[PDB]
Amino acid sequence: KEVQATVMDWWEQPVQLCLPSEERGGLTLRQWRERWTVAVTALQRATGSRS
Amino acid sequence: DLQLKRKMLESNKLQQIEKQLYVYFFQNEEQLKSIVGKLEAQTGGGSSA
Amino acid sequence: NAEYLEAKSNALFLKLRMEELQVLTDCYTPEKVLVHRQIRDTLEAGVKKEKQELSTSRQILSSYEFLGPEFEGLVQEYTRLKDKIKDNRWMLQELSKSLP
Amino acid sequence: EIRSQNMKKLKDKSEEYKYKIHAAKDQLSSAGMEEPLTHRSLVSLSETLTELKAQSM
């Protein structure tokens, strides 16, 4: 069960959410991940890529 | 489970970069701006055709 | 039969421990360990600052709590009076905006 | 007799796993990794900061 939890922590990487009020370039890490997620989904739509 | 998750990371380079975004946020703000901005510029160039 | 079952138990456990350690090396690269250190130091500085604001706020509170229940009734009466004066001053400010 | 042959193969694999375990521990130590820097430790440190801000307010 401990090994399965270590595999979960490697797969989720929860530390990235520990500082929500830090801003770099006038945006929070969450807003940067949202910009990334929107840009990745726009690029997957444009590439006609049947995922 | 471990063999499945490793094959996902080897096949999807965009997911591998997503997992590094927080490293760039704390170490190199210009590189964060450049990586996200290159992905956004590759999506926006479609109005001069 | 006893020796064979012992050897199979040990081999299964060592395989499990090996895969765990390989996931931990894949997790904690030198660049990420540096970022985790910056995050730790920012969090520890936050925890230390808040423990100090909490302690100072509790000491000033205990100095007023020593003045007894009759003082706490007088504080409630003054707070209720100061709120009414603030409401009446706000009403006067809105009328004078309406002349050209 | 089949179990005895399989026992030899299991002992040989057990020594192979001990070697990989040592190499992985040496790599983790070389990365400057400490127990307070783990994902679990830092999340627990974030949760304790949020609990303290609620008490301070």
PDB file of N, CA, C and O in Angstrom, chain A:
ATOM      1  N   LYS A   1       0.819  -1.222   0.000  1.00  0.00           N
ATOM      2  CA  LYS A   1       0.000   0.000   0.000  1.00  0.00           C
ATOM      3  C   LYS A   1       0.850   1.269   0.000  1.00  0.00           C
ATOM      4  O   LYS A   1       0.484   2.251  -0.643  1.00  0.00           O
ATOM      5  N   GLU A   2       1.986   1.249   0.696  1.00  0.00           N
ATOM      6  CA  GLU A   2       2.929   2.371   0.700  1.00  0.00           C
ATOM      7  C   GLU A   2       3.542   2.574  -0.684  1.00  0.00           C
ATOM      8  O   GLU A   2       3.554   3.695  -1.187  1.00  0.00           O
ATOM      9  N   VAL A   3       3.941   1.487  -1.351  1.00  0.00           N
ATOM     10  CA  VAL A   3       4.469   1.559  -2.720  1.00  0.00           C
ATOM     11  C   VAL A   3       3.423   2.123  -3.683  1.00  0.00           C
ATOM     12  O   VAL A   3       3.736   2.996  -4.493  1.00  0.00           O
ATOM     13  N   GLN A   4       2.163   1.694  -3.571  1.00  0.00           N
ATOM     14  CA  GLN A   4       1.083   2.214  -4.411  1.00  0.00           C
ATOM     15  C   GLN A   4       0.830   3.713  -4.174  1.00  0.00           C
ATOM     16  O   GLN A   4       0.574   4.458  -5.122  1.00  0.00           O
ATOM     17  N   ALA A   5       0.974   4.184  -2.933  1.00  0.00           N
ATOM     18  CA  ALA A   5       0.914   5.606  -2.627  1.00  0.00           C
ATOM     19  C   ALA A   5       2.094   6.397  -3.214  1.00  0.00           C
ATOM     20  O   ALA A   5       1.892   7.479  -3.760  1.00  0.00           O
ATOM     21  N   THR A   6       3.307   5.847  -3.179  1.00  0.00           N
ATOM     22  CA  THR A   6       4.481   6.460  -3.818  1.00  0.00           C
ATOM     23  C   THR A   6       4.290   6.598  -5.335  1.00  0.00           C
ATOM     24  O   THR A   6       4.628   7.629  -5.921  1.00  0.00           O
ATOM     25  N   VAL A   7       3.677   5.596  -5.979  1.00  0.00           N
ATOM     26  CA  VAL A   7       3.306   5.644  -7.406  1.00  0.00           C
ATOM     27  C   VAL A   7       2.250   6.722  -7.678  1.00  0.00           C
ATOM     28  O   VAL A   7       2.323   7.408  -8.700  1.00  0.00           O
ATOM     29  N   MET A   8       1.289   6.906  -6.771  1.00  0.00           N
ATOM     30  CA  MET A   8       0.300   7.987  -6.846  1.00  0.00           C
ATOM     31  C   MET A   8       0.946   9.368  -6.713  1.00  0.00           C
ATOM     32  O   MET A   8       0.694  10.229  -7.551  1.00  0.00           O
ATOM     33  N   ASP A   9       1.827   9.576  -5.734  1.00  0.00           N
ATOM     34  CA  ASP A   9       2.504  10.863  -5.530  1.00  0.00           C
ATOM     35  C   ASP A   9       3.382  11.244  -6.733  1.00  0.00           C
ATOM     36  O   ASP A   9       3.408  12.405  -7.148  1.00  0.00           O
ATOM     37  N   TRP A  10       4.060  10.268  -7.347  1.00  0.00           N
ATOM     38  CA  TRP A  10       4.806  10.463  -8.596  1.00  0.00           C
ATOM     39  C   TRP A  10       3.893  10.844  -9.774  1.00  0.00           C
ATOM     40  O   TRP A  10       4.251  11.671 -10.628  1.00  0.00           O
ATOM     41  N   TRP A  11       2.685  10.273  -9.816  1.00  0.00           N
ATOM     42  CA  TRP A  11       1.705  10.546 -10.860  1.00  0.00           C
ATOM     43  C   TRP A  11       0.904  11.844 -10.655  1.00  0.00           C
ATOM     44  O   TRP A  11       0.582  12.495 -11.641  1.00  0.00           O
ATOM     45  N   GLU A  12       0.647  12.304  -9.437  1.00  0.00           N
ATOM     46  CA  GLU A  12      -0.109  13.549  -9.199  1.00  0.00           C
ATOM     47  C   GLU A  12       0.805  14.761  -8.958  1.00  0.00           C
ATOM     48  O   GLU A  12       0.500  15.878  -9.374  1.00  0.00           O
ATOM     49  N   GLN A  13       1.984  14.548  -8.358  1.00  0.00           N
ATOM     50  CA  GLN A  13       2.932  15.594  -7.957  1.00  0.00           C
ATOM     51  C   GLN A  13       2.251  16.743  -7.182  1.00  0.00           C
ATOM     52  O   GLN A  13       2.230  17.873  -7.661  1.00  0.00           O
ATOM     53  N   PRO A  14       1.691  16.518  -5.987  1.00  0.00           N
ATOM     54  CA  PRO A  14       0.800  17.483  -5.327  1.00  0.00           C
ATOM     55  C   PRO A  14       1.468  18.795  -4.846  1.00  0.00           C
ATOM     56  O   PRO A  14       0.785  19.789  -4.604  1.00  0.00           O
ATOM     57  N   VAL A  15       2.804  18.863  -4.780  1.00  0.00           N
ATOM     58  CA  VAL A  15       3.550  20.053  -4.289  1.00  0.00           C
ATOM     59  C   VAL A  15       3.326  21.319  -5.107  1.00  0.00           C
ATOM     60  O   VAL A  15       3.388  22.421  -4.568  1.00  0.00           O
ATOM     61  N   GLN A  16       3.010  21.186  -6.392  1.00  0.00           N
ATOM     62  CA  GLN A  16       2.774  22.330  -7.282  1.00  0.00           C
ATOM     63  C   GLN A  16       1.594  23.212  -6.837  1.00  0.00           C
ATOM     64  O   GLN A  16       1.510  24.360  -7.257  1.00  0.00           O
ATOM     65  N   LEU A  17       0.702  22.727  -5.965  1.00  0.00           N
ATOM     66  CA  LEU A  17      -0.457  23.483  -5.470  1.00  0.00           C
ATOM     67  C   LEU A  17      -0.245  24.125  -4.085  1.00  0.00           C
ATOM     68  O   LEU A  17      -1.149  24.786  -3.583  1.00  0.00           O
ATOM     69  N   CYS A  18       0.936  23.976  -3.476  1.00  0.00           N
ATOM     70  CA  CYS A  18       1.197  24.433  -2.104  1.00  0.00           C
ATOM     71  C   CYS A  18       1.371  25.964  -1.954  1.00  0.00           C
ATOM     72  O   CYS A  18       1.251  26.486  -0.848  1.00  0.00           O
ATOM     73  N   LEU A  19       1.643  26.709  -3.038  1.00  0.00           N
ATOM     74  CA  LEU A  19       1.822  28.177  -3.033  1.00  0.00           C
ATOM     75  C   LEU A  19       0.859  28.866  -4.023  1.00  0.00           C
ATOM     76  O   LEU A  19       1.269  29.280  -5.107  1.00  0.00           O
ATOM     77  N   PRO A  20      -0.437  29.005  -3.686  1.00  0.00           N
ATOM     78  CA  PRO A  20      -1.438  29.538  -4.615  1.00  0.00           C
ATOM     79  C   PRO A  20      -1.337  31.052  -4.872  1.00  0.00           C
ATOM     80  O   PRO A  20      -1.817  31.513  -5.902  1.00  0.00           O
ATOM     81  N   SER A  21      -0.739  31.824  -3.958  1.00  0.00           N
ATOM     82  CA  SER A  21      -0.639  33.295  -4.029  1.00  0.00           C
ATOM     83  C   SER A  21       0.666  33.819  -4.645  1.00  0.00           C
ATOM     84  O   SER A  21       0.859  35.027  -4.712  1.00  0.00           O
ATOM     85  N   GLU A  22       1.579  32.932  -5.039  1.00  0.00           N
ATOM     86  CA  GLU A  22       2.792  33.312  -5.767  1.00  0.00           C
ATOM     87  C   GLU A  22       2.428  33.669  -7.213  1.00  0.00           C
ATOM     88  O   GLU A  22       1.779  32.887  -7.913  1.00  0.00           O
ATOM     89  N   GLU A  23       2.870  34.840  -7.666  1.00  0.00           N
ATOM     90  CA  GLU A  23       2.697  35.301  -9.041  1.00  0.00           C
ATOM     91  C   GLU A  23       4.055  35.446  -9.726  1.00  0.00           C
ATOM     92  O   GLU A  23       4.971  36.086  -9.210  1.00  0.00           O
ATOM     93  N   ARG A  24       4.167  34.895 -10.935  1.00  0.00           N
ATOM     94  CA  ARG A  24       5.314  35.086 -11.832  1.00  0.00           C
ATOM     95  C   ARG A  24       4.797  35.557 -13.179  1.00  0.00           C
ATOM     96  O   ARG A  24       3.928  34.924 -13.782  1.00  0.00           O
ATOM     97  N   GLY A  25       5.296  36.694 -13.647  1.00  0.00           N
ATOM     98  CA  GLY A  25       4.781  37.342 -14.853  1.00  0.00           C
ATOM     99  C   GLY A  25       3.347  37.867 -14.726  1.00  0.00           C
ATOM    100  O   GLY A  25       2.660  37.943 -15.741  1.00  0.00           O
ATOM    101  N   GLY A  26       2.908  38.203 -13.504  1.00  0.00           N
ATOM    102  CA  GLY A  26       1.558  38.701 -13.195  1.00  0.00           C
ATOM    103  C   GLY A  26       0.461  37.629 -13.202  1.00  0.00           C
ATOM    104  O   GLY A  26      -0.716  37.966 -13.260  1.00  0.00           O
ATOM    105  N   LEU A  27       0.840  36.347 -13.211  1.00  0.00           N
ATOM    106  CA  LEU A  27      -0.077  35.210 -13.202  1.00  0.00           C
ATOM    107  C   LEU A  27       0.382  34.176 -12.173  1.00  0.00           C
ATOM    108  O   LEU A  27       1.578  33.950 -11.976  1.00  0.00           O
ATOM    109  N   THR A  28      -0.584  33.508 -11.556  1.00  0.00           N
ATOM    110  CA  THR A  28      -0.342  32.376 -10.648  1.00  0.00           C
ATOM    111  C   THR A  28      -0.014  31.096 -11.429  1.00  0.00           C
ATOM    112  O   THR A  28      -0.359  30.967 -12.607  1.00  0.00           O
ATOM    113  N   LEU A  29       0.610  30.094 -10.790  1.00  0.00           N
ATOM    114  CA  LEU A  29       0.915  28.805 -11.442  1.00  0.00           C
ATOM    115  C   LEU A  29      -0.344  28.136 -12.024  1.00  0.00           C
ATOM    116  O   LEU A  29      -0.300  27.549 -13.104  1.00  0.00           O
ATOM    117  N   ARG A  30      -1.476  28.238 -11.321  1.00  0.00           N
ATOM    118  CA  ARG A  30      -2.753  27.674 -11.772  1.00  0.00           C
ATOM    119  C   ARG A  30      -3.230  28.333 -13.065  1.00  0.00           C
ATOM    120  O   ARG A  30      -3.598  27.618 -13.988  1.00  0.00           O
ATOM    121  N   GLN A  31      -3.132  29.660 -13.165  1.00  0.00           N
ATOM    122  CA  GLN A  31      -3.451  30.396 -14.394  1.00  0.00           C
ATOM    123  C   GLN A  31      -2.488  30.051 -15.539  1.00  0.00           C
ATOM    124  O   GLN A  31      -2.909  29.947 -16.689  1.00  0.00           O
ATOM    125  N   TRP A  32      -1.206  29.814 -15.243  1.00  0.00           N
ATOM    126  CA  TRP A  32      -0.249  29.317 -16.234  1.00  0.00           C
ATOM    127  C   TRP A  32      -0.579  27.898 -16.714  1.00  0.00           C
ATOM    128  O   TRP A  32      -0.558  27.655 -17.922  1.00  0.00           O
ATOM    129  N   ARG A  33      -0.929  26.969 -15.807  1.00  0.00           N
ATOM    130  CA  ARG A  33      -1.403  25.623 -16.181  1.00  0.00           C
ATOM    131  C   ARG A  33      -2.711  25.695 -16.958  1.00  0.00           C
ATOM    132  O   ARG A  33      -2.842  24.979 -17.939  1.00  0.00           O
ATOM    133  N   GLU A  34      -3.647  26.572 -16.608  1.00  0.00           N
ATOM    134  CA  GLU A  34      -4.874  26.785 -17.387  1.00  0.00           C
ATOM    135  C   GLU A  34      -4.567  27.307 -18.796  1.00  0.00           C
ATOM    136  O   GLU A  34      -5.036  26.704 -19.761  1.00  0.00           O
ATOM    137  N   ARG A  35      -3.710  28.334 -18.951  1.00  0.00           N
ATOM    138  CA  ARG A  35      -3.239  28.793 -20.277  1.00  0.00           C
ATOM    139  C   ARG A  35      -2.616  27.656 -21.077  1.00  0.00           C
ATOM    140  O   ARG A  35      -2.937  27.489 -22.250  1.00  0.00           O
ATOM    141  N   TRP A  36      -1.783  26.835 -20.440  1.00  0.00           N
ATOM    142  CA  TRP A  36      -1.207  25.652 -21.072  1.00  0.00           C
ATOM    143  C   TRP A  36      -2.279  24.646 -21.500  1.00  0.00           C
ATOM    144  O   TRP A  36      -2.285  24.210 -22.644  1.00  0.00           O
ATOM    145  N   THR A  37      -3.222  24.313 -20.618  1.00  0.00           N
ATOM    146  CA  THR A  37      -4.276  23.324 -20.888  1.00  0.00           C
ATOM    147  C   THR A  37      -5.174  23.784 -22.041  1.00  0.00           C
ATOM    148  O   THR A  37      -5.495  22.984 -22.921  1.00  0.00           O
ATOM    149  N   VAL A  38      -5.522  25.079 -22.086  1.00  0.00           N
ATOM    150  CA  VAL A  38      -6.284  25.713 -23.178  1.00  0.00           C
ATOM    151  C   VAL A  38      -5.491  25.699 -24.487  1.00  0.00           C
ATOM    152  O   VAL A  38      -6.035  25.335 -25.530  1.00  0.00           O
ATOM    153  N   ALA A  39      -4.197  26.025 -24.452  1.00  0.00           N
ATOM    154  CA  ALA A  39      -3.343  25.992 -25.637  1.00  0.00           C
ATOM    155  C   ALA A  39      -3.136  24.556 -26.166  1.00  0.00           C
ATOM    156  O   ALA A  39      -3.226  24.334 -27.371  1.00  0.00           O
ATOM    157  N   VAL A  40      -2.955  23.559 -25.289  1.00  0.00           N
ATOM    158  CA  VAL A  40      -2.846  22.133 -25.657  1.00  0.00           C
ATOM    159  C   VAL A  40      -4.144  21.621 -26.279  1.00  0.00           C
ATOM    160  O   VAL A  40      -4.101  20.962 -27.317  1.00  0.00           O
ATOM    161  N   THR A  41      -5.304  21.954 -25.703  1.00  0.00           N
ATOM    162  CA  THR A  41      -6.606  21.552 -26.269  1.00  0.00           C
ATOM    163  C   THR A  41      -6.911  22.251 -27.595  1.00  0.00           C
ATOM    164  O   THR A  41      -7.452  21.615 -28.501  1.00  0.00           O
ATOM    165  N   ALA A  42      -6.536  23.526 -27.762  1.00  0.00           N
ATOM    166  CA  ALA A  42      -6.659  24.231 -29.040  1.00  0.00           C
ATOM    167  C   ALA A  42      -5.780  23.595 -30.131  1.00  0.00           C
ATOM    168  O   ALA A  42      -6.235  23.393 -31.259  1.00  0.00           O
ATOM    169  N   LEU A  43      -4.552  23.208 -29.780  1.00  0.00           N
ATOM    170  CA  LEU A  43      -3.606  22.577 -30.697  1.00  0.00           C
ATOM    171  C   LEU A  43      -4.046  21.151 -31.064  1.00  0.00           C
ATOM    172  O   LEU A  43      -3.989  20.790 -32.237  1.00  0.00           O
ATOM    173  N   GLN A  44      -4.588  20.375 -30.115  1.00  0.00           N
ATOM    174  CA  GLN A  44      -5.203  19.064 -30.383  1.00  0.00           C
ATOM    175  C   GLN A  44      -6.453  19.160 -31.279  1.00  0.00           C
ATOM    176  O   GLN A  44      -6.617  18.329 -32.170  1.00  0.00           O
ATOM    177  N   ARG A  45      -7.299  20.194 -31.113  1.00  0.00           N
ATOM    178  CA  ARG A  45      -8.433  20.454 -32.027  1.00  0.00           C
ATOM    179  C   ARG A  45      -7.968  20.813 -33.439  1.00  0.00           C
ATOM    180  O   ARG A  45      -8.505  20.275 -34.402  1.00  0.00           O
ATOM    181  N   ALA A  46      -6.985  21.707 -33.563  1.00  0.00           N
ATOM    182  CA  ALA A  46      -6.475  22.160 -34.857  1.00  0.00           C
ATOM    183  C   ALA A  46      -5.731  21.054 -35.613  1.00  0.00           C
ATOM    184  O   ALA A  46      -5.870  20.931 -36.827  1.00  0.00           O
ATOM    185  N   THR A  47      -4.986  20.206 -34.903  1.00  0.00           N
ATOM    186  CA  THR A  47      -4.269  19.081 -35.523  1.00  0.00           C
ATOM    187  C   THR A  47      -5.189  17.945 -35.967  1.00  0.00           C
ATOM    188  O   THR A  47      -4.697  16.915 -36.423  1.00  0.00           O
ATOM    189  N   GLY A  48      -6.521  18.108 -35.870  1.00  0.00           N
ATOM    190  CA  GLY A  48      -7.502  17.083 -36.235  1.00  0.00           C
ATOM    191  C   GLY A  48      -7.238  15.756 -35.532  1.00  0.00           C
ATOM    192  O   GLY A  48      -7.695  14.705 -35.991  1.00  0.00           O
ATOM    193  N   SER A  49      -6.433  15.787 -34.470  1.00  0.00           N
ATOM    194  CA  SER A  49      -5.853  14.583 -33.934  1.00  0.00           C
ATOM    195  C   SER A  49      -6.972  13.915 -33.166  1.00  0.00           C
ATOM    196  O   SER A  49      -7.371  14.381 -32.100  1.00  0.00           O
ATOM    197  N   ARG A  50      -7.506  12.840 -33.752  1.00  0.00           N
ATOM    198  CA  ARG A  50      -8.267  11.823 -33.033  1.00  0.00           C
ATOM    199  C   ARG A  50      -7.349  11.283 -31.939  1.00  0.00           C
ATOM    200  O   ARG A  50      -6.599  10.343 -32.185  1.00  0.00           O
ATOM    201  N   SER A  51      -7.354  11.923 -30.775  1.00  0.00           N
ATOM    202  CA  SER A  51      -7.154  11.169 -29.546  1.00  0.00           C
ATOM    203  C   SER A  51      -8.462  10.500 -29.179  1.00  0.00           C
ATOM    204  O   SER A  51      -9.522  11.137 -29.378  1.00  0.00           O
TER     205      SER A  51
END
